[PDB]
Structure formats: structure tokens, C-alpha cells
């Protein structure tokens, strides 16, 4: 699921209190034994 | 098939707690032996028949059969106690399924000696001697338990004290033939079929029983060990 | 010696995962390192026919 929503400039970094649905783009099958998780930058 | 820890860990002073799984087949039928090895020297048996011990065995060592799993436990452990421990049970399917070890580490008179190794061309292979010094050869039976350099240990094959039935491992089987003689302690293991896969020491072991170890199934175990040769074919 | 055949695993298979391996399988704890010691072998049983 993703949605873009105004995250115009606010107090310090936090989650925004505001209400945003989330719609799915992409269903891709998929059987894996998914346990952990580690993310990348550029 | 045993399923046991592959190195466990503990202080000094306290103690520590060791267990052998094994289905209804084995353990549920027979008894666990707990074997020691010392890194470097041959084993030596730790408990038999998870109720007594030998006499060279202090009273450090317990052993309890709860259930289809074998516990191990060792009041107030020191530095000596670091050594390999292993567990063995005669399935009923006729063989001798042994351990895989517990390298329980932390940092703070009759001599069975054999012969008969040497390295030897591939395909073939010579005889594996064995001897003993005024132990009763009659009155005991004897097993043959390799152990591959840093591998563990495993049952190759038995005779009994009465020098009639013997069996050998599932993979042993019929390209070995195992015998004795009406001279001096001794014994006889023919091999054929080499495949090369047979890099071990071949402990020529003194066991306590008279008959095979599937009819007493409760006074079976395996006394003092001996040096055992170092035969490496490699190919 | 086309048609293989894997062998028991110390963990049950997930559905829709497929099961390619191709090391040695290790008994209890005792590693035999490649080369084939006791109830240690190769998952690659191959089957026979006549």
C-alpha cells in the first residue's frame, strides 16, 4: 500500500496527527519465509 | 537418530544440565549410555544404564531417564570437567546409534591397545588387529567404535563373549566380517570394499556383557577403552 | 539419475517455497564435512526404476 499526503512544515520530526487512507498499487505473489527486515540509502 | 546440544556453555562452581533426545525405538526400549572423552587420550565410559557407574566414575556425575530423553548432570563442574560427552543406545533394529557431543567448555588395570592401520591402496584394505593382557576373552564381548580426526564417534560392529551371533553397522554391513580365535586375547576385522571414506581410529572397545547387546537390554555398556591406531587411506 | 529425490530436513518445508539445496545434511550436531560419516549424506537420492 502507499499514499502521498500534505506533510507541510510542522513541528520537529514526528508522525502528523491526521487521518490518510492507504490504497494498494502493487499485489506481486510471493511464498517466501519472510522473518526480518534491513533497509538501504543511497 | 539422537538429537543432542552441539556445545553448551557455564561458570565454575554451579552446575550445568546436558540431555539426549531419542525416539520410543531407542531410547524407550533400552538404556542411554553417557560416554567422557578427553581431548587427546582414548574415552573412557562415564554412566551405564542411566542408574549406576564404575568405580573409577566419583560421584560428580548423575544420569536420569525421565521420559523417552536421556538428563545428564554434573554438581559443581571445574576445569577437569571440560571434556567431550557423548550418548549411545542399541536401537531395536539391531545397531548401535551413538551422539553427535556436548563440548561443555569453560574458560574459569588391563590395557586394550590395537594395531593394524597404515595407510593402503584404495579399493582394498588389510586386517585390524586387536589385543589385551589377562582380561577374560571369553567372559566379554567387544565392540569396534571409529572416531574420524575432530569428527565424533560411531558403532562399527560386536561380538559377544560367546563368539556366536554378530552384527555390524547399517553401512558396514557385508563387506566386513569380524572373528576371533582360541589363541590369546585377541580379534579379527577383515574390511572390504574401501571406499575411502574410513579416515578413523577404529577403538577396539571392552564391553562387560557375555551375549550381543540386544537380548540384555539393561547390563550392556562398554569398559575401559584402548589406544587405538591412526589408519588413513586417503585414497 | 535425472529424476532426484531430496531426503528428511531438521525443518518443516513452507508451502509454495521451493526446497533447492545441495549441501550435506548434518546429524544432530555433528558436522561431517562433506565428506560422508555416518547418517550423514546428500539430500540427492536418486530413484530407481525398472
Known amino acids: 500500500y502507499s499514499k502521498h499526503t500534505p506533510i507541510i512544515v510542522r513541528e520537529p520530526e514526528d508522525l502528523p496527527q491526521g487521518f490518510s487512507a492507504l490504497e494498494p498499487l502493487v499485489d506481486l505473489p510471493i511464498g517466501i519465509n519472510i522473518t526480518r527486515f534491513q533497509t538501504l540509502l543511497a | 537418530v539422537l538429537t543432542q546440544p552441539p556445545s553448551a556453555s557455564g561458570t565454575p562452581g554451579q552446575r550445568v544440565t546436558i540431555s539426549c533426545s531419542g525416539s520410543?525405538?531407542?531410547?524407550?526400549?533400552?538404556?542411554v549410555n553417557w560416554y567422557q572423552q578427553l581431548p587427546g587420550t582414548a574415552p573412557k565410559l562415564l554412566i551405564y544404564?542411566?542408574?549406576q557407574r564404575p568405580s573409577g566414575v566419583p560421584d560428580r556425575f548423575s544420569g536420569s531417564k525421565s521420559g523417552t530423553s536421556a538428563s545428564l548432570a554434573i554438581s559443581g563442574l571445574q576445569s577437569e570437567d571440560e571434556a567431550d560427552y557423548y550418548c549411545?543406545?542399541?536401537?531395536?533394529?539391531?545397531?548401535?546409534?551413538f551422539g553427535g557431543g556436548t563440548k561443555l567448555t569453560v574458560l574459569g588395570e588391563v590395557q586394550l591397545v590395537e594395531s593394524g592401520g597404515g595407510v593402503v591402496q584404495p579399493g582394498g584394505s588389510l586386517r585390524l588387529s586387536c589385543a589385551a593382557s589377562?582380561?577374560?576373552?571369553?567372559?566379554?564381548?567387544m565392540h569396534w567404535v571409529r572416531q574420524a580426526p575432530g569428527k565424533g564417534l560411531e558403532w562399527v560392529s560386536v561380538?559377544?563373549?560367546?563368539?556366536?551371533?554378530?552384527y555390524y553397522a547399517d553401512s558396514v554391513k557385508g563387506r566386513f566380517s569380524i572373528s576371533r580365535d582360541d589363541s590369546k586375547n585377541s580379534l579379527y576385522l577383515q574390511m572390504n570394499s574401501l571406499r575411502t571414506e574410513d579416515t578413523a581410529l577404529y577403538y577396539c572397545?571392552?564391553?562387560?556383557?557375555?551375549?550381543?547387546?540386544?537380548?540384555?537390554?539393561?547390563?550392556?555398556?562398554?569398559?575401559?577403552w584402548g589406544q587405538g591406531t591412526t589408519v588413513t587411506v586417503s585414497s | 539419475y535425472n529424476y532426484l529425490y531430496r531426503l528428511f530436513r531438521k525443518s518443516n518445508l513452507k508451502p509454495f517455497e521451493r526446497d533447492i539445496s545441495t549441501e550435506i545434511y548434518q546429524a544432530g550436531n555433528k558436522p561431517c564435512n562433506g565428506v560422508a560419516g555416518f547418517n550423514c549424506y546428500f539430500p540427492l537420492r536418486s530413484y530407481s526404476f525398472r
Open positions: 544404564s542411566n542408574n
Open positions: 561380538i559377544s563373549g560367546d563368539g556366536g551371533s554378530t
Open positions: 520410543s525405538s531407542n531410547i524407550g526400549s533400552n538404556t
Open positions: 589377562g582380561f577374560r576373552f571369553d567372559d566379554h564381548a
Open positions: 549411545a543406545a542399541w536401537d531395536d533394529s539391531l545397531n548401535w546409534v
Open positions: 572397545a571392552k564391553d562387560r556383557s557375555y551375549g550381543p547387546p540386544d537380548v540384555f537390554n539393561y547390563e550392556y555398556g562398554m569398559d575401559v
